[PDB]
Tab-separated table of C-alpha atoms in Angstrom:
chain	number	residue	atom	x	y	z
A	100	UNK	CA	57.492	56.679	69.638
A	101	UNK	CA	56.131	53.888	71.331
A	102	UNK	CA	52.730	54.118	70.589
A	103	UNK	CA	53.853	54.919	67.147
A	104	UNK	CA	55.669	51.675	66.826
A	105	UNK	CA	52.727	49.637	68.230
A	106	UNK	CA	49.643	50.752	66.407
A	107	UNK	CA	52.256	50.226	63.210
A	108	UNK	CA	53.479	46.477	63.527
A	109	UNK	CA	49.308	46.050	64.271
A	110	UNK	CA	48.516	47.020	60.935
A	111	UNK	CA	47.463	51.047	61.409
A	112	UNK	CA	48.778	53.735	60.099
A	113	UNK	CA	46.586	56.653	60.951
A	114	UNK	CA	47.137	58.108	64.394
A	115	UNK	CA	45.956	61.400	66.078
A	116	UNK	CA	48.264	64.017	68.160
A	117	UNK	CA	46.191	66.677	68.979
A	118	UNK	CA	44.783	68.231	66.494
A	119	UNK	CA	47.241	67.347	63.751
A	120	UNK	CA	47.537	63.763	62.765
A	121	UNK	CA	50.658	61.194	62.215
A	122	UNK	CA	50.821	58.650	59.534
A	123	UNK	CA	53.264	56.576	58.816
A	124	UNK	CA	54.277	55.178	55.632
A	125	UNK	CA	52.809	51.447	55.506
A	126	UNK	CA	54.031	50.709	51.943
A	127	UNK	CA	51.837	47.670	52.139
A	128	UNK	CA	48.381	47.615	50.479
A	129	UNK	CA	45.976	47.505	53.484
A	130	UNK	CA	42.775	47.215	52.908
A	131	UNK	CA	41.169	50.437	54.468
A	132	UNK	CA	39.675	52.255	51.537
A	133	UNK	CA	36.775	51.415	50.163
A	134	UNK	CA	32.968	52.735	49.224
A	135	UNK	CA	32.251	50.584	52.579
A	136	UNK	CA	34.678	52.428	54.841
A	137	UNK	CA	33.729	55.478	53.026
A	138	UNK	CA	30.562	55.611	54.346
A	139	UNK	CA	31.318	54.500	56.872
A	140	UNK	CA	32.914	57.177	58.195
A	141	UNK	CA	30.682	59.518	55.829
A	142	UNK	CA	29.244	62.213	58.696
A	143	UNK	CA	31.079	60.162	61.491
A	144	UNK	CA	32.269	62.316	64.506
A	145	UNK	CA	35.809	62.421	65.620
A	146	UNK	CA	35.464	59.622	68.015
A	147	UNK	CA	32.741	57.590	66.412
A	148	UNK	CA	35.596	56.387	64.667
B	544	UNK	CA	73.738	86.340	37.636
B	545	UNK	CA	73.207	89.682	35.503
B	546	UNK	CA	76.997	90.366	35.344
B	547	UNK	CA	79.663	88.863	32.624
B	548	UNK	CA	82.768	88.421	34.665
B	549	UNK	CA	80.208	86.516	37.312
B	550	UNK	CA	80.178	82.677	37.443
B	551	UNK	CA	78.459	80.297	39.588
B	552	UNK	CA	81.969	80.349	41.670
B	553	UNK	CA	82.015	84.189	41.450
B	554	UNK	CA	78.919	83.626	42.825
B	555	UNK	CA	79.410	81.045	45.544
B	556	UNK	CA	82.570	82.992	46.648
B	557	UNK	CA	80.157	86.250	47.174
B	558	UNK	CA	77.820	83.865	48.561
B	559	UNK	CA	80.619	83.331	51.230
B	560	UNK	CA	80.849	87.239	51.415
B	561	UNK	CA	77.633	87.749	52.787
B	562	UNK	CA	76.118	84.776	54.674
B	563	UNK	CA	79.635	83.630	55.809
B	564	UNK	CA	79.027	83.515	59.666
B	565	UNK	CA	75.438	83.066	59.172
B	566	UNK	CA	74.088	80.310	61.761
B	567	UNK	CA	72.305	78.736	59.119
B	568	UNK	CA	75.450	78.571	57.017
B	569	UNK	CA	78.281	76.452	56.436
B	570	UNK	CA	81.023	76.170	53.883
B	571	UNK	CA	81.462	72.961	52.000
B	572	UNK	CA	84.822	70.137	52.378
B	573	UNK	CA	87.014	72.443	50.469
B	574	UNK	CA	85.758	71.262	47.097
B	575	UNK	CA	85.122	75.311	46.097
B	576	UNK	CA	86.335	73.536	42.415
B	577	UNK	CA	83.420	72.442	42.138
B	578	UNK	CA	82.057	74.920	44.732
B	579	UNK	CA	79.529	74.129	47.046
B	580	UNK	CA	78.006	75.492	49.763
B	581	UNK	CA	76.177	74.132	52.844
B	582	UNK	CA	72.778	75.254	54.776
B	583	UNK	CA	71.257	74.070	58.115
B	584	UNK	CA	67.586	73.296	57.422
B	585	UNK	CA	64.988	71.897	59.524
B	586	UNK	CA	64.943	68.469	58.035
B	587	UNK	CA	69.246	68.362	57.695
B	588	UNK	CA	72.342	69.665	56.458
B	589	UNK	CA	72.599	69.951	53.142
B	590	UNK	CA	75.840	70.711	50.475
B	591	UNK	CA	74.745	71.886	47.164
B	592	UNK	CA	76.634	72.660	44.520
B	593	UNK	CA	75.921	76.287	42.867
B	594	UNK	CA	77.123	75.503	39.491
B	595	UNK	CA	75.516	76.269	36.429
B	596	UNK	CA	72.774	78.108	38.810
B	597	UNK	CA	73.226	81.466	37.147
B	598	UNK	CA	72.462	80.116	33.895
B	599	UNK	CA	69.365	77.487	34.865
B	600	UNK	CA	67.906	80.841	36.872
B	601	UNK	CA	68.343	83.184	33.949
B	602	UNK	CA	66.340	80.408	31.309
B	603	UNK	CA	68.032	81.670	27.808
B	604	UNK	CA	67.630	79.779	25.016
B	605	UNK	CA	67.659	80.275	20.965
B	606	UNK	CA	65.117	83.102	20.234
B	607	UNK	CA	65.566	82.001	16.472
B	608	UNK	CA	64.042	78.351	16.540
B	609	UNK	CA	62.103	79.706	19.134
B	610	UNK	CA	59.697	82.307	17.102
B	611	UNK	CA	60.631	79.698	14.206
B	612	UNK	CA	58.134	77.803	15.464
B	613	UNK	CA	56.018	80.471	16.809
B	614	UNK	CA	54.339	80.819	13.389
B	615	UNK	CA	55.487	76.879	12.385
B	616	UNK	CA	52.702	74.806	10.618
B	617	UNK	CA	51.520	72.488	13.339
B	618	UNK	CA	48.861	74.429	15.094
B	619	UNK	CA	49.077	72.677	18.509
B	620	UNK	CA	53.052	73.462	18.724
B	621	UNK	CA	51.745	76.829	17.116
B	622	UNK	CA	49.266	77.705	20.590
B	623	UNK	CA	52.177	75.543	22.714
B	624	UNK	CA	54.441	78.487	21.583
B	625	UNK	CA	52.194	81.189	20.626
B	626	UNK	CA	53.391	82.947	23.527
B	627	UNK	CA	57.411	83.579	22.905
B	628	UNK	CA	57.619	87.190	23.756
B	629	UNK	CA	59.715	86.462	26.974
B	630	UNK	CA	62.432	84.099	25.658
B	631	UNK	CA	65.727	86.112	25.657
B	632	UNK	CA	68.469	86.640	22.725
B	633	UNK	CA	70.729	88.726	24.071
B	655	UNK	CA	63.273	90.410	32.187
B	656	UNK	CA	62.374	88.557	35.699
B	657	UNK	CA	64.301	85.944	37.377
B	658	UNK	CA	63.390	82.473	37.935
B	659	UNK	CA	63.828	82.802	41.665
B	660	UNK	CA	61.730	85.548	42.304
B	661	UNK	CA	59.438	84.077	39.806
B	662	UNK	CA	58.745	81.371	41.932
B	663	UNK	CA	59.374	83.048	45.256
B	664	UNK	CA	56.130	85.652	44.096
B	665	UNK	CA	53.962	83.146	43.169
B	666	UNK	CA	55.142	81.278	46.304
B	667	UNK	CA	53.926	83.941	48.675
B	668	UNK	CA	50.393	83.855	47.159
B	669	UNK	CA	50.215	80.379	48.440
B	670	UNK	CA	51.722	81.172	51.263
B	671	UNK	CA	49.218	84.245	51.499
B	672	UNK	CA	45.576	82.331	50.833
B	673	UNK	CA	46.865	79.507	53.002
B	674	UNK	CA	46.954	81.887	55.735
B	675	UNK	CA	43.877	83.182	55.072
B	676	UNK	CA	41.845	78.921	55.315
B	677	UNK	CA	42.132	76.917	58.213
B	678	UNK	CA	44.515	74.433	58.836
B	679	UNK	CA	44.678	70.816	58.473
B	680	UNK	CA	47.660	69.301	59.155
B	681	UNK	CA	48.648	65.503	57.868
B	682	UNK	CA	51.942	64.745	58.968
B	683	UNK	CA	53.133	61.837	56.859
B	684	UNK	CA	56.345	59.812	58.462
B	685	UNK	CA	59.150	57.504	56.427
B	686	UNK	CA	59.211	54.742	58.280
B	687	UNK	CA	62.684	53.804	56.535
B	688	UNK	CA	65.101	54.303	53.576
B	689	UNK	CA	64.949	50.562	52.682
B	690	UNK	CA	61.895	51.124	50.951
B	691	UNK	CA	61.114	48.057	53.033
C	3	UNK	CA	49.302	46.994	-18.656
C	4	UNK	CA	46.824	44.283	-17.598
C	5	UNK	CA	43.742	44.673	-20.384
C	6	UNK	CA	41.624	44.932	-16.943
C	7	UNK	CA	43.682	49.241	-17.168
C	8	UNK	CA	44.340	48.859	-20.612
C	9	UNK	CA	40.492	48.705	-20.974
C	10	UNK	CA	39.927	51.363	-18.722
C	11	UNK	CA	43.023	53.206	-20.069
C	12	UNK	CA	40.903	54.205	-23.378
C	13	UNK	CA	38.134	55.031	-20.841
C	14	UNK	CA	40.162	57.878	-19.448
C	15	UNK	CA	42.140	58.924	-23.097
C	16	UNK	CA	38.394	58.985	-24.310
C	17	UNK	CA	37.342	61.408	-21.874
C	18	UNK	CA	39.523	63.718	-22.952
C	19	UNK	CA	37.961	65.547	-26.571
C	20	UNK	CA	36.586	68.236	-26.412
C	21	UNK	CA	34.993	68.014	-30.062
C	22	UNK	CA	35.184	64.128	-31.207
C	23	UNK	CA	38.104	62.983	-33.864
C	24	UNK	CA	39.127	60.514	-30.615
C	25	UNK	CA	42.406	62.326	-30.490
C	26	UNK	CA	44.421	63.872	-27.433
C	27	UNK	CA	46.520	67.268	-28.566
C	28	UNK	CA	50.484	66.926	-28.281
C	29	UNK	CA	49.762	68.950	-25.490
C	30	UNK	CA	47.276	66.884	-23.368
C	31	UNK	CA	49.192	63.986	-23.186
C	32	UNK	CA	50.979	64.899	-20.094
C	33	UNK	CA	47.550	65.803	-17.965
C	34	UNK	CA	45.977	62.373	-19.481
C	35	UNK	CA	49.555	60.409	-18.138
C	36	UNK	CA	49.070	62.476	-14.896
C	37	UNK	CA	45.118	61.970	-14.776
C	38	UNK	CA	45.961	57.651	-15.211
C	39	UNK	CA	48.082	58.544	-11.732
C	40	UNK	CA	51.469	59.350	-13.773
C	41	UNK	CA	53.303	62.006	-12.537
C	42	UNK	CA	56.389	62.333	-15.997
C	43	UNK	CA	58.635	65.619	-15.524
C	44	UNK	CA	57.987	67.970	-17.884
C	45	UNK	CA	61.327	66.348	-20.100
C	46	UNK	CA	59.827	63.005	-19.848
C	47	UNK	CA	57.010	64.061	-21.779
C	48	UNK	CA	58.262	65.540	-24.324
C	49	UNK	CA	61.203	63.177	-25.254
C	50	UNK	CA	58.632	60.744	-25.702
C	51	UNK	CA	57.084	62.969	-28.139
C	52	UNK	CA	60.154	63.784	-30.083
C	53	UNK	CA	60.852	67.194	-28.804
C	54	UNK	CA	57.892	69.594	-31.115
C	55	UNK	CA	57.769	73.238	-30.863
C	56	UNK	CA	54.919	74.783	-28.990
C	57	UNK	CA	53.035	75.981	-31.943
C	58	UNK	CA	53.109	72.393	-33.752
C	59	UNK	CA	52.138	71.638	-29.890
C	60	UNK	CA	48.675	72.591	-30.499
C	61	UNK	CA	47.583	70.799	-33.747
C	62	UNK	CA	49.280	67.522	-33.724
C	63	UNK	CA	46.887	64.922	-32.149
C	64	UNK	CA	46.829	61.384	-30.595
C	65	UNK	CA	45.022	57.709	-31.247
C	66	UNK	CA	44.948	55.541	-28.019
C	67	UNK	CA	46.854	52.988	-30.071
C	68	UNK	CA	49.751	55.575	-30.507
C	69	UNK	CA	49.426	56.988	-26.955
C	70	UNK	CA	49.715	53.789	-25.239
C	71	UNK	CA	52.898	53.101	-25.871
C	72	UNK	CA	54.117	56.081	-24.311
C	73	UNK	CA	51.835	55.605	-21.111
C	74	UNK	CA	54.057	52.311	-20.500
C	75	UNK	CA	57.144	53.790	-22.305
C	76	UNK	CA	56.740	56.292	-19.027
C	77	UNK	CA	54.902	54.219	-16.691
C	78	UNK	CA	58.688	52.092	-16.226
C	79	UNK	CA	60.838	54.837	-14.778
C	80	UNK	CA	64.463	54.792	-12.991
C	81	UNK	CA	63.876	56.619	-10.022
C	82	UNK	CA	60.879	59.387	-8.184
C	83	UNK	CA	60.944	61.937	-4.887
C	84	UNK	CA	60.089	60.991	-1.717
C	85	UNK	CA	59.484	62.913	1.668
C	86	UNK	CA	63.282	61.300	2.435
C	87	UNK	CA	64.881	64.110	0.135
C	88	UNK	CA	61.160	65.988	-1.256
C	89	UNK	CA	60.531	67.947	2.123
C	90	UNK	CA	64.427	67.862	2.733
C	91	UNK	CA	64.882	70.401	0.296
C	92	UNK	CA	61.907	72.684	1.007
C	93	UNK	CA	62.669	72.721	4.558
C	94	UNK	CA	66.147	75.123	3.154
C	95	UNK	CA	63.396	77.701	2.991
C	96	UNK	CA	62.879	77.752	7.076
C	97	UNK	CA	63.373	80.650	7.830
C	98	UNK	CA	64.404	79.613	11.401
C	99	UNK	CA	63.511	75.604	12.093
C	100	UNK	CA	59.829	76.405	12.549
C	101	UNK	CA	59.137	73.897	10.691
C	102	UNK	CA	56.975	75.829	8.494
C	103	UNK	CA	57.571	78.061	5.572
C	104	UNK	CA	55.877	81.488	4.588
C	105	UNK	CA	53.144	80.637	1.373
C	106	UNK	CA	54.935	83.432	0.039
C	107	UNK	CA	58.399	82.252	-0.106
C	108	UNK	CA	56.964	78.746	-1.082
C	109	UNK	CA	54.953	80.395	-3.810
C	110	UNK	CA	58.006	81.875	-5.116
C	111	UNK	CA	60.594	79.276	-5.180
C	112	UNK	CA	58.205	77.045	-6.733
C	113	UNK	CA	57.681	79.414	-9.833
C	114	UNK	CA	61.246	80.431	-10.270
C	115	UNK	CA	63.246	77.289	-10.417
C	116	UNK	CA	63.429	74.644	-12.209
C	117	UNK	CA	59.694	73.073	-14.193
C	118	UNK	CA	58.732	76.843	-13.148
C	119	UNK	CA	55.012	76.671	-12.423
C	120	UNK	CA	52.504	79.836	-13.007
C	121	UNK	CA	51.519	81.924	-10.063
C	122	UNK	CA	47.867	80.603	-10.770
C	123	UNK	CA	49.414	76.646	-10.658
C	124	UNK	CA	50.822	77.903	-6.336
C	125	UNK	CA	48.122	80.170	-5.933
C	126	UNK	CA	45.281	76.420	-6.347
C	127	UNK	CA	48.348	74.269	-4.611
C	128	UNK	CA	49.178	75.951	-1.289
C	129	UNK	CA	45.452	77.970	-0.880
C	130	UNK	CA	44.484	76.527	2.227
C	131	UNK	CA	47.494	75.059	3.822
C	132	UNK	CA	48.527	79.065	4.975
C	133	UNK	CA	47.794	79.809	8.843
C	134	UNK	CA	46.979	82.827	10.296
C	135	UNK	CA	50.009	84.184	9.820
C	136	UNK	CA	49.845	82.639	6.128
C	137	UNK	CA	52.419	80.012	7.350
C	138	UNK	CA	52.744	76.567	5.308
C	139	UNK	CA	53.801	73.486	7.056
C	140	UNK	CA	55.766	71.571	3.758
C	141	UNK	CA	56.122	68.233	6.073
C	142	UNK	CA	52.394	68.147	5.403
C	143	UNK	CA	51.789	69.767	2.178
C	144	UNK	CA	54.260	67.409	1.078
C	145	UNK	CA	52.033	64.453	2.481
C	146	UNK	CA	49.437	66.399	0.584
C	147	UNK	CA	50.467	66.003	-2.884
C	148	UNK	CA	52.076	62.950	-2.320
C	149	UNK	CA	49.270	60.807	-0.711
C	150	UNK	CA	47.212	62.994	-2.622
């Protein structure tokens, strides 16, 4: 819950557990979407990123 | 819901009949007038209220107006409804309808691999 | 009638002999009212040409001069259809709220009531409105003769 609660309040959503993933609701417009983060992350490992 | 002296209390009182005892059951606050039931999900307890569910999982409606248009002028509500030959003025259920289709998800799903996103309300305040 | 129509008036009422005297048969009148965008009842028509009798119907003739002042005469009317009531009535013929009505009924109402038509007069007004299933949607074909 913790760690859940922390990574929120800093401003990410996007958290692993595992293999599956949690992700809660921001409802805020962050700004981590874009043709630069896309490619980013385009061919990226699991920990690269 | 293929039975005249049935309604959706008829129904809810069977419903009692069966389940009943079942672990995952529950009967509602005494408000059977409007007759509800309860059901322990995963998410929550939940009372709904079985009226007018024999009717909305039967889907009748007025074969007349129906084919009326099935032949009507306007060619796009003409193709919309060129297909009436199931609407009823008097074949399968709407929830086994679903519940078919339902398990061929549920049956090509099980068949990929797995990527689960689980997405978390943070709150009800929409804050 | 502005001179500017009036002008063109004889224009039209010209084009309209088949030989050359310069006169319109009793008879024509109503196409050559119709043609200049009129659209007189059958009745209106012929009380502005004091009632004849078919036969008469085919050899008395018409000057401009004289025929003008009928076109007017006509041309100031009391009332006219509209979609409003127009479709209203031919959507009686429904069969069930389609929306659309069978070329087949339409053909016959409209040749057994009232200014009864011939099946030829149908047969040139509906040709081409009839689906597959030779179904008429009146909402339009209304439209059609109206706009037209």
């Amino acid at each position: 819950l913790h760690n859940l609660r922390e990574r929120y309040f800093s401003g990410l959503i996007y958290t692993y557990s595992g293999l599956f993933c949690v992700v809660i609701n921001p409802y805020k417009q962050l700004p981590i979407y874009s043709e630069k983060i896309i490619d980013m992350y385009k061919g990226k490992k699991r920990h690269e990123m | 819901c293929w039975f005249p002296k049935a309604t959706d209390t008829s129904f809810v009182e069977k419903l009692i009949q069966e389940q009943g005892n079942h672990a995952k059951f529950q009967k509602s606050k005494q408000l059977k007038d409007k007759t509800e039931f309860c059901i322990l999900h995963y998410a929550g307890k939940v009372t709904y209220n079985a009226s007018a569910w024999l009717t909305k999982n039967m889907d009748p409606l007025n074969d007349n107006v129906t084919s009326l248009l099935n032949q009507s002028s306007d060619k796009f509500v003409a193709d919309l409804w060129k297909d009436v030959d199931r609407i009823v003025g008097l074949f399968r259920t709407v929830g086994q309808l679903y519940k078919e289709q339902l398990t061929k998800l549920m049956t090509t799903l099980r068949n990929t691999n797995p990527n689960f996103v689980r997405c978390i309300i943070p709150n009800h305040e929409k804050r | 009638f502005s001179e500017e129509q009036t002008a063109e008036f004889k224009e039209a009422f010209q084009l309209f002999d088949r030989t050359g005297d310069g006169k319109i048969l009793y008879s024509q009148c109503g196409d050559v009212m119709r043609a200049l965008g009129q659209n007189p009842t059958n009745a209106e028509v012929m009380k502005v040409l004091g009632n004849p009798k078919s036969d008469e119907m085919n050899l008395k003739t018409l000057k401009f001069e004289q025929f003008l002042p009928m076109m007017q005469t006509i041309a100031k009317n009391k009332d006219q259809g509209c979609f409003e009531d127009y479709v209203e009535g031919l959507r009686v013929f429904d069969k069930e709220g389609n929306g659309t009505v069978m070329g087949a009924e339409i053909r016959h109402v409209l040749v057994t009531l009232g200014e009864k038509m011939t099946e030829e007069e149908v047969e040139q007004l509906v040709a081409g409105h009839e689906d597959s299933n030779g179904c008429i949607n009146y909402e339009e074909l209304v439209r059609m003769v109206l706009s037209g």
